[PDB]
Amino acid sequence: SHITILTLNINGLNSAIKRHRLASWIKSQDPSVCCIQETHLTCRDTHRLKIKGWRKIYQANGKQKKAGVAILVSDKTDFKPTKIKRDKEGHYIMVKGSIQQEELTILNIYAPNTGAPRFIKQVLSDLQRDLDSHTLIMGDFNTPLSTLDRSTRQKVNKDTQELNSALHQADLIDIYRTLHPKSTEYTFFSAPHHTYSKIDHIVGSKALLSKCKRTEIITNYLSDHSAIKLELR
Ligand SMILES: [Mg+2]
Protein backbone atom coordinates (compact mmCIF):
# COMPACT_ATOMS: atom_id res chain seq x y z
CA SER A 1 0.00 0.00 0.00
CA HIS A 2 1.63 3.10 -1.36
CA ILE A 3 2.25 6.24 0.69
CA THR A 4 1.43 9.56 -0.97
CA ILE A 5 2.92 12.87 0.23
CA LEU A 6 1.41 16.22 -0.75
CA THR A 7 2.84 19.72 -0.33
CA LEU A 8 0.80 22.90 -0.74
CA ASN A 9 1.25 26.53 0.21
CA ILE A 10 -2.35 27.35 1.16
CA ASN A 11 -1.99 31.17 1.36
CA GLY A 12 -3.69 31.60 4.72
CA LEU A 13 -6.23 29.69 6.82
CA ASN A 14 -7.56 32.38 9.19
CA SER A 15 -10.99 32.21 7.51
CA ALA A 16 -13.52 29.44 8.07
CA ILE A 17 -14.55 29.19 4.41
CA LYS A 18 -10.93 28.59 3.37
CA ARG A 19 -10.56 25.88 6.03
CA HIS A 20 -13.68 24.14 4.80
CA ARG A 21 -12.49 24.12 1.22
CA LEU A 22 -9.00 22.93 2.14
CA ALA A 23 -10.67 20.03 3.97
CA SER A 24 -12.71 19.04 0.93
CA TRP A 25 -9.63 19.33 -1.31
CA ILE A 26 -7.45 17.26 1.03
CA LYS A 27 -10.20 14.66 1.34
CA SER A 28 -10.46 14.51 -2.47
CA GLN A 29 -6.69 14.12 -2.84
CA ASP A 30 -6.57 11.52 -0.01
CA PRO A 31 -2.84 11.92 0.81
CA SER A 32 -1.16 9.76 3.43
CA VAL A 33 0.82 12.84 4.56
CA CYS A 34 0.16 16.49 3.72
CA CYS A 35 2.62 19.37 4.19
CA ILE A 36 1.00 22.82 4.32
CA GLN A 37 2.78 26.18 4.30
CA GLU A 38 1.58 29.68 5.21
CA THR A 39 -1.37 28.64 7.35
CA HIS A 40 -0.97 32.16 8.81
CA LEU A 41 -2.17 30.82 12.17
CA THR A 42 -0.63 32.18 15.36
CA CYS A 43 0.60 29.93 18.16
CA ARG A 44 -2.78 30.76 19.75
CA ASP A 45 -4.96 29.62 16.88
CA THR A 46 -3.57 26.18 15.96
CA HIS A 47 -6.64 24.24 17.06
CA ARG A 48 -8.62 25.92 14.30
CA LEU A 49 -6.91 23.58 11.83
CA LYS A 50 -8.96 20.34 11.95
CA ILE A 51 -9.97 17.95 9.14
CA LYS A 52 -11.77 14.57 9.36
CA GLY A 53 -9.52 11.68 8.39
CA TRP A 54 -6.41 13.67 9.42
CA ARG A 55 -6.51 13.71 13.22
CA LYS A 56 -2.73 13.91 13.72
CA ILE A 57 -1.75 17.48 12.78
CA TYR A 58 1.65 18.83 13.83
CA GLN A 59 2.17 22.59 13.56
CA ALA A 60 4.83 25.27 13.97
CA ASN A 61 3.66 28.86 14.32
CA GLY A 62 4.93 32.26 15.37
CA LYS A 63 3.02 34.85 17.33
CA GLN A 64 1.61 36.70 14.30
CA LYS A 65 -0.70 35.83 11.40
CA LYS A 66 2.40 35.18 9.31
CA ALA A 67 4.06 32.00 8.02
CA GLY A 68 2.79 28.92 9.82
CA VAL A 69 3.34 25.31 8.73
CA ALA A 70 1.63 22.00 9.38
CA ILE A 71 2.09 18.30 8.67
CA LEU A 72 -1.14 16.28 8.54
CA VAL A 73 -1.14 12.48 8.72
CA SER A 74 -4.11 10.44 7.51
CA ASP A 75 -6.11 8.43 10.04
CA LYS A 76 -5.68 5.48 7.62
CA THR A 77 -1.88 5.71 7.89
CA ASP A 78 -0.39 3.70 10.74
CA PHE A 79 2.08 6.36 11.84
CA LYS A 80 4.24 6.23 14.97
CA PRO A 81 6.02 9.53 15.66
CA THR A 82 9.55 9.63 17.07
CA LYS A 83 10.51 13.30 16.83
CA ILE A 84 8.80 16.62 16.08
CA LYS A 85 10.91 19.78 15.74
CA ARG A 86 9.00 23.06 15.45
CA ASP A 87 10.42 26.39 14.31
CA LYS A 88 9.77 29.07 16.92
CA GLU A 89 9.09 31.46 14.00
CA GLY A 90 6.72 29.07 12.22
CA HIS A 91 8.79 28.64 9.06
CA TYR A 92 9.50 24.92 9.27
CA ILE A 93 8.54 21.71 11.03
CA MET A 94 10.27 18.36 10.99
CA VAL A 95 8.32 15.20 11.74
CA LYS A 96 10.24 11.93 12.10
CA GLY A 97 8.60 8.54 12.44
CA SER A 98 7.76 5.19 10.92
CA ILE A 99 4.96 4.09 8.58
CA GLN A 100 4.53 0.33 8.06
CA GLN A 101 7.78 0.01 10.07
CA GLU A 102 9.75 2.15 7.52
CA GLU A 103 11.36 5.23 8.99
CA LEU A 104 10.65 8.56 7.33
CA THR A 105 12.07 12.01 8.06
CA ILE A 106 9.98 14.90 6.70
CA LEU A 107 11.03 18.53 6.85
CA ASN A 108 8.27 20.94 5.83
CA ILE A 109 9.76 24.33 5.05
CA TYR A 110 8.39 27.77 4.18
CA ALA A 111 11.27 30.06 3.19
CA PRO A 112 10.84 33.85 3.43
CA ASN A 113 10.51 35.98 0.29
CA THR A 114 13.91 37.61 0.85
CA GLY A 115 17.10 35.59 1.23
CA ALA A 116 15.24 32.30 0.75
CA PRO A 117 18.11 29.92 -0.22
CA ARG A 118 20.35 31.27 2.55
CA PHE A 119 17.59 30.69 5.11
CA ILE A 120 17.14 27.12 3.84
CA LYS A 121 20.87 26.39 3.97
CA GLN A 122 20.94 27.64 7.56
CA VAL A 123 18.00 25.36 8.43
CA LEU A 124 19.79 22.35 6.94
CA SER A 125 22.73 23.44 9.10
CA ASP A 126 20.65 23.72 12.28
CA LEU A 127 19.01 20.33 11.62
CA GLN A 128 21.94 18.35 10.22
CA ARG A 129 21.95 15.89 13.13
CA ASP A 130 18.49 14.72 12.06
CA LEU A 131 19.08 14.48 8.31
CA ASP A 132 19.44 10.86 7.20
CA SER A 133 19.12 8.44 4.28
CA HIS A 134 15.30 8.62 4.37
CA THR A 135 14.81 12.37 4.47
CA LEU A 136 12.27 14.34 2.45
CA ILE A 137 12.48 18.15 2.37
CA MET A 138 9.44 19.74 0.78
CA GLY A 139 7.54 22.99 0.78
CA ASP A 140 7.74 26.54 -0.52
CA PHE A 141 11.45 27.25 -0.97
CA ASN A 142 10.55 30.61 -2.54
CA THR A 143 13.41 29.95 -4.97
CA PRO A 144 14.13 28.06 -8.18
CA LEU A 145 16.76 25.36 -7.89
CA SER A 146 17.76 25.12 -11.57
CA THR A 147 17.39 27.18 -14.74
CA LEU A 148 14.33 25.28 -15.94
CA ASP A 149 12.48 26.24 -12.71
CA ARG A 150 11.86 29.73 -14.19
CA SER A 151 10.16 30.84 -17.39
CA THR A 152 12.99 33.37 -17.81
CA ARG A 153 15.48 30.41 -17.78
CA GLN A 154 17.96 32.68 -16.02
CA LYS A 155 20.81 31.13 -14.11
CA VAL A 156 20.29 30.65 -10.41
CA ASN A 157 22.06 33.18 -8.18
CA LYS A 158 25.13 32.43 -6.06
CA ASP A 159 23.09 31.84 -2.89
CA THR A 160 21.11 29.16 -4.76
CA GLN A 161 24.32 27.52 -6.01
CA GLU A 162 25.54 27.23 -2.43
CA LEU A 163 22.23 25.75 -1.26
CA ASN A 164 22.47 23.16 -4.05
CA SER A 165 26.05 22.38 -3.02
CA ALA A 166 24.88 21.99 0.59
CA LEU A 167 22.15 19.64 -0.69
CA HIS A 168 24.73 17.63 -2.63
CA GLN A 169 27.00 17.31 0.43
CA ALA A 170 24.04 15.88 2.41
CA ASP A 171 23.29 13.42 -0.44
CA LEU A 172 20.02 15.24 -1.20
CA ILE A 173 18.54 15.56 -4.69
CA ASP A 174 15.65 17.40 -6.32
CA ILE A 175 13.31 14.40 -6.69
CA TYR A 176 10.93 16.20 -9.03
CA ARG A 177 13.72 17.34 -11.35
CA THR A 178 15.34 13.88 -11.17
CA LEU A 179 12.12 12.16 -12.28
CA HIS A 180 11.40 14.92 -14.85
CA PRO A 181 14.75 16.31 -16.02
CA LYS A 182 13.27 18.37 -18.87
CA SER A 183 10.15 19.60 -17.06
CA THR A 184 9.04 23.19 -17.72
CA GLU A 185 6.12 23.19 -15.27
CA TYR A 186 5.59 25.89 -12.66
CA THR A 187 3.92 26.23 -9.28
CA PHE A 188 3.72 30.03 -8.93
CA PHE A 189 2.99 33.04 -11.16
CA SER A 190 4.12 36.60 -10.37
CA ALA A 191 1.87 39.12 -12.11
CA PRO A 192 4.20 42.18 -11.74
CA HIS A 193 6.80 40.47 -13.92
CA HIS A 194 4.66 38.11 -16.06
CA THR A 195 6.98 35.42 -14.68
CA TYR A 196 6.25 31.76 -13.89
CA SER A 197 8.43 29.72 -11.59
CA LYS A 198 8.72 26.43 -9.74
CA ILE A 199 9.46 27.64 -6.19
CA ASP A 200 7.79 24.66 -4.53
CA HIS A 201 9.98 21.58 -4.28
CA ILE A 202 10.36 17.97 -3.23
CA VAL A 203 13.97 17.24 -2.23
CA GLY A 204 14.98 13.88 -0.81
CA SER A 205 17.73 11.50 0.13
CA LYS A 206 19.31 9.89 -2.92
CA ALA A 207 18.65 6.49 -1.31
CA LEU A 208 14.89 7.15 -1.52
CA LEU A 209 14.99 7.49 -5.33
CA SER A 210 14.08 3.86 -5.98
CA LYS A 211 10.97 4.31 -3.81
CA CYS A 212 9.80 7.43 -5.71
CA LYS A 213 7.22 6.08 -8.14
CA ARG A 214 5.54 9.25 -9.45
CA THR A 215 5.54 12.98 -8.82
CA GLU A 216 3.18 15.56 -10.30
CA ILE A 217 1.98 19.16 -10.03
CA ILE A 218 -1.67 19.87 -9.16
CA THR A 219 -3.16 23.26 -10.02
CA ASN A 220 -6.01 24.40 -7.80
CA TYR A 221 -8.51 27.14 -6.91
CA LEU A 222 -7.55 27.44 -3.22
CA SER A 223 -4.24 29.27 -3.29
CA ASP A 224 -1.72 31.19 -5.37
CA HIS A 225 0.53 28.08 -5.39
CA SER A 226 0.07 24.76 -7.13
CA ALA A 227 0.57 21.61 -5.08
CA ILE A 228 3.11 18.83 -5.61
CA LYS A 229 2.30 15.18 -4.93
CA LEU A 230 4.77 12.33 -4.47
CA GLU A 231 3.87 8.64 -4.58
CA LEU A 232 6.17 6.28 -2.70
CA ARG A 233 6.44 2.57 -3.46
MG1 LIG B 1 2.32 33.54 0.03
Author numbering: 6 to 238
Q: What does the original paper state about this entry?
A:
The autonomous non-LTR retrotransposon long interspersed nuclear element-1 (LINE-1 or L1) is one the most abundant mobile elements in the human genome, comprising 17–20% of its content. ORF1p acts as a nucleic acid chaperone that binds L1 RNA, while ORF2p provides endonuclease (EN), reverse transcriptase (RT) and RNA-binding activities through three distinct functional domains. L1-EN belongs to the family of metal-dependent phosphohydrolases that includes apurinic/apyrimidinic endonuclease 1 (APE1) and DNase I, which are part of the exonuclease-endonuclease-phosphatase (EEP) domain superfamily.
To confirm the position of the catalytic metal in L1-EN, we soaked crystals of WT L1-EN (formed without DNA) with 20 mM MgCl2 during cryoprotection and refined the structure to 2.0 Å resolution. In addition to the four water molecules coordinated by Mg2+, there were other water molecules near the active site. The one with the strongest electron density is coordinated by Asp145 (2.6 Å) and Asn147 (2.7 Å). Upon superposition of our Mg-bound L1-EN structure with the structures of our DNA-bound L1-EN complexes, distances between the modeled Mg2+ and the scissile bond OP2 are 3.8 Å for B-form DNA and 1.4 Å for the alternative conformation with the phosphate rotated. We modeled a L1-EN-DNA complex with a bound Mg2+ ion by forcefield relaxation in the mixed constraints with active site amino acids around Mg2+ coming from our structure of Mg2+-bound WT L1-EN without DNA and the rest of the amino acids coming from our structure of L1-EN-D145A/Y226K complexed with dna14. Notably, about halfway through the rotation, the phosphate approaches W5, which is coordinated by Asp145 and favorably positioned for nucleophilic attack on the phosphate.
